[PDB]
Scaffold this active site. Sequence first.
Site, mmCIF file in Angstrom:
data_model
loop_
_atom_site.group_PDB
_atom_site.id
_atom_site.type_symbol
_atom_site.label_atom_id
_atom_site.label_comp_id
_atom_site.label_asym_id
_atom_site.label_seq_id
_atom_site.Cartn_x
_atom_site.Cartn_y
_atom_site.Cartn_z
ATOM 1 C CG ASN A 105 -1.851 -1.174 1.289
ATOM 2 O OD1 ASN A 105 -2.306 -1.687 0.267
ATOM 3 N ND2 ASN A 105 -2.122 -1.636 2.503
ATOM 4 C CB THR A 155 15.114 -18.070 -27.449
ATOM 5 O OG1 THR A 155 15.346 -17.321 -28.648
ATOM 6 C CG2 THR A 155 15.755 -17.341 -26.281
ATOM 7 C CE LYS A 157 14.218 -14.925 -31.403
ATOM 8 N NZ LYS A 157 13.294 -13.779 -31.169
ATOM 9 C CE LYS A 159 9.652 -14.264 -27.844
ATOM 10 N NZ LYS A 159 11.054 -13.852 -27.559
ATOM 11 C CE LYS A 183 13.969 -18.358 -22.433
ATOM 12 N NZ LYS A 183 13.000 -18.241 -23.558
ATOM 13 C CG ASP A 185 9.967 -18.065 -27.668
ATOM 14 O OD1 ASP A 185 10.815 -17.222 -27.310
ATOM 15 O OD2 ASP A 185 9.952 -18.576 -28.807
ATOM 16 C CD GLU A 186 10.565 -15.165 -23.222
ATOM 17 O OE1 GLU A 186 9.649 -14.847 -24.010
ATOM 18 O OE2 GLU A 186 11.775 -15.017 -23.492
ATOM 19 C CG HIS A 276 12.256 -15.045 -19.378
ATOM 20 N ND1 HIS A 276 11.382 -13.980 -19.413
ATOM 21 C CD2 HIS A 276 13.204 -14.784 -20.308
ATOM 22 C CE1 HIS A 276 11.786 -13.111 -20.322
ATOM 23 N NE2 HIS A 276 12.889 -13.575 -20.879
ATOM 24 N NE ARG A 277 15.781 -9.616 -17.879
ATOM 25 C CZ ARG A 277 16.730 -8.693 -17.893
ATOM 26 N NH1 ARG A 277 17.183 -8.149 -16.774
ATOM 27 N NH2 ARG A 277 17.235 -8.299 -19.059
ATOM 28 C CG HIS A 309 16.233 -14.726 -18.699
ATOM 29 N ND1 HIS A 309 15.754 -15.903 -18.166
ATOM 30 C CD2 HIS A 309 16.417 -14.958 -20.020
ATOM 31 C CE1 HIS A 309 15.646 -16.805 -19.125
ATOM 32 N NE2 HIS A 309 16.044 -16.259 -20.260
ATOM 33 C CE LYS A 316 21.040 -3.455 -30.124
ATOM 34 N NZ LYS A 316 21.419 -3.848 -31.506
ATOM 35 C CB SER A 361 19.163 -14.299 -23.466
ATOM 36 O OG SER A 361 18.588 -14.578 -24.731
#
Lengths: 445, 445, 84, 107, 107
Positions: A105, A155, A157, A159, A183, A185-186, A276-277, A309, A316, A361
């Site tokens: 709260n 992952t 591919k 997806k 892995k 896909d999430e 996974h996050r 993750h 980048k 990843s």
Amino acid sequence: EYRDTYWTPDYVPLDTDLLACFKCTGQEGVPKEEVAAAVAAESSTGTWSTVWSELLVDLDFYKGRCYRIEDVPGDKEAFYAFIAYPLDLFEEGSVTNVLTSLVGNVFGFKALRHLRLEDIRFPMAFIKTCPGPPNGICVERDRMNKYGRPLLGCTIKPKLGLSGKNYGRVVYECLRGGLDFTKDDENINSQPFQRWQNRFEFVAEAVALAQQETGEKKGHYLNCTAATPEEMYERAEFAKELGQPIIMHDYITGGFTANTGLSKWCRKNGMLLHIHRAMHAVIDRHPKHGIHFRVLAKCLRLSGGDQLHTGTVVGKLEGDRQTTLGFIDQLRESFIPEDRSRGNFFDQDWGSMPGVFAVASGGIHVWHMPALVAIFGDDSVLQFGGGTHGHPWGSAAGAAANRVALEACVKARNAGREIEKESRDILMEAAKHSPELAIALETWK
Amino acid sequence: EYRDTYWTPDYVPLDTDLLACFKCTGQEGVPKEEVAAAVAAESSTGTWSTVWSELLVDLDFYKGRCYRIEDVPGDKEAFYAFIAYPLDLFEEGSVTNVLTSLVGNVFGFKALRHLRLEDIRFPMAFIKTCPGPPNGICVERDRMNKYGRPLLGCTIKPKLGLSGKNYGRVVYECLRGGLDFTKDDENINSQPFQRWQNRFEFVAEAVALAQQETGEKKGHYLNCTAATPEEMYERAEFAKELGQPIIMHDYITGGFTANTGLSKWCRKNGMLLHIHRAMHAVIDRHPKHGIHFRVLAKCLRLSGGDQLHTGTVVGKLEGDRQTTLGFIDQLRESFIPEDRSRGNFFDQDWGSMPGVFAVASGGIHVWHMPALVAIFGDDSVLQFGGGTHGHPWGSAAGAAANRVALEACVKARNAGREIEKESRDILMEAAKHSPELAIALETWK
Amino acid sequence: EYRDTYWTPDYVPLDTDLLACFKCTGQEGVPKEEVAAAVAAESSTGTWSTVWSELLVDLDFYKGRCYRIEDVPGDKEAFYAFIA
Amino acid sequence: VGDYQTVATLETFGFLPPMTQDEIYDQIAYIIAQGWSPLIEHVHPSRSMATYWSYWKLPFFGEKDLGVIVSELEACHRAYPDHHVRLVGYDAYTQSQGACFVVFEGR
Amino acid sequence: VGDYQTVATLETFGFLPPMTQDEIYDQIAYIIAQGWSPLIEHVHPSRSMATYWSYWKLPFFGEKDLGVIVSELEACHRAYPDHHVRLVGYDAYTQSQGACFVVFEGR
């Protein structure tokens, strides 16, 4: 005014207390002590006027204590606040209860322009109460018999869209190239185009075939996040029957309760747990408000789990890798000294409770690997979904190229060499025996 | 005064009664008959004044009878007292009930300076009621296909700290040297550094590998003593699924009820049961007060079990091996004649109820083995934790050296030779083909 | 002799440790520190000679510590020993 | 253009060509620099899927010399010149294998 | 110094060198002195892990002569000179094997 009973000018936290750090911004021209005390009370106690029932229980003992206000290095309106919590305010091993008591709260009070949970110092007792990760870092290494190098995932591919046979053969092609894991896909658990039973059966068959062929203990991450806990347990036990040594889950979307139950089941059945996050950014994308990812990482480590993750940070955004390495430290080491630069505001010790693997990843491929090894150490996993699959020679060739790149990089690191600078020479030397690595390094120079 | 109704000058015990021997020391200058009758009553009946409800049930029939006071050879204040018990005073096959009715409250009476339970003569009926050992001596020999020689075990050193893989590989190294079994440490069931599931899985894999390699049916003692009976049964059934032929337990710490339940489960599932005597010394270290270890051995044999720790007596303390061999007789033979020197005060017959293996461990190594074989016979097991592990050539070499020493010793014993005197010649002749045995005998001459 | 690694003259127990008190009586004319260290080791670790496997796990961290020997008020042969 | 044939590889440097002796020196020097302990494992290639290989002489604790390690490696290689022989660095404080790779591959 | 290689041994005197004939005489004399009964078992070495071996002529009860036992041993050895042959002493009162060990090992 609540400072008089919820601001402590000279209190020293007890070693069994729960210590929380909040980056707080109240309204303009408000007492910082008053807003910090308001946050501390709103975590435990709140009344709009004189009340009666609070005289039947000692509010003095069952109340939080904000004991230190520090000036944030960069904003004089934002300030770090350290609030204490008596141990009795929580459940014995319920991360869900911790989150409810911490952010249930407090974020709704109008007297706060912004509030961000920064750091939590969990007492040794509460850590010993929680089940923790079912296996641990060294135990996972023993169960996979993989050492020396970080592990390599990817992952699958695209997806979605794959049938059981197609998904299984793609996983087999990725795995037979020396890749450690794959892995799912999430957002892919059970679909009208693909029922989970067929995917699990075919991927188990493919994993067995690849394990027989390559002569290495391999596995694929199987997802059990679903609509109901009954379905989750059913899929987990089905994977257990099919000899699959690891399953995966989304702890935020599925829930902390579901994650804790899944971890307890994995410990009771001797299973590895991947996590996974998904939806973590919705809580940590904003750099000034929300919950920092280190808190979520602490909560997941307490709730159990073997992998988490992170990205790296690089590929980048050069960013602020210091705090990333900080939460990596909080993920791996049993104890971590205080580091303001790394975002570690407490002397946190985990006793002898095993740590959690880090997962890097997204937006990465062969060119980044030396820096990834340098920053993440040996206790991490690297996933290249598009990079391995987008390799023109096929997923197997891309996985082999990434595997040999990782082997050469860890060899050079063990040689005592500074990998970051001479990385180009390292990759050229590796390509002197792997043409697929050469063409990959050519693709994304 | 309680002699008039609880001291019997001329009573002869019935063959269905339970006969108990107490070494009693009352206060100075007290009637020995009176204190013996007080002990006998305090086992069954006790009132501070005239009472009413005892006239609704025949106290005459449901009361114990102390029928013989004998002078202890060595103290004239301490005296042996023989107390009878009607069969109906106990449960049909509950050693727990026997202990409650025998030592539940007698040790708290102020009129006794010291009290020690020496011997118990269990009636044939009560023995036939109890489940008894699940397998038995000959049945265990059949299930292991091991004869001719005593069996060879070892505790896994160090006492703790090993992970599942490390514990498993240490057990494998110990087992592949011809060692019969290995016992987990009595205080190691489930630890933060080692969860029991991983240890059981890895040790089962190691046992299977060693069994395949050496061409012999082997096994390791798995511990199921834990916090709850549910966890104990779960671990026992997990060991059953993993093909492990024997599990171990601590009956005193876990409890007589837990031991009886575990033995019944082992019989129902065809499992071998190993037992360690942890905390027995706290009951028998004092030579004048407490409970003699022969009583505990009788209770364990009635409650079920295949192995029981004893030491030998020798290695550190030449001691009084007579009574040790006496309780060995009570552990192995179906009937044992009275022997005051061996501490056997009753003509005890077990019918055709199989006996229990003896376990000799602690403070022993290669040099003691001939005397150990001579005193313990062929129905025993020898454990050398430090000796086999502390051997400079490794645990496997130490286990092989102890195995060949045992083989040579039992060969010479079967040859009709007095092993105790010429033991040095026996070990030299054995070392003429086992250099590891030679260096071991050199280490602890 | 086991005092050198199982008797701690100046160690202070950690607040997460398990502290045990033993009223101990060794044999006549024995070092009280040595018998206290023997009890402490016999609770955790015991070897009769040089051993190998103990170098694969840090025995230093996984071992008990007897840190205080106090004289019992009433017997000078019996002594209170505090083991961590 | 061209395919990558499946190869029975040997666990972290199974893909690369067999290491040179100077590289073995560097690897063992790194193992020394990390405080780990060398350990020699040999096993028949048919049983590569087993969990525990046949260990050589006990792990060398406190050993900080490369030459003795190389001598033990060549001795064990001559002991079983048809078995797979690998070198493993053991970490006592974490109860894991800090680094491991094959040195000699069997015929 | 040196290793102890794993050896496929044969159950209580599988480690020691093969027993001499006088030692066989002493063993059978001991079996006689214990009131047990001799019994001859032969089986192919590939099936050593079985529970019951191929028994020779029925166990000899009341037989107290060593020479007949030796003659039966050599006869059974010539019957299957490639099988493992062991001698077992059976105790009727305890329904167990009082003593057992291999006499002839196959090629």
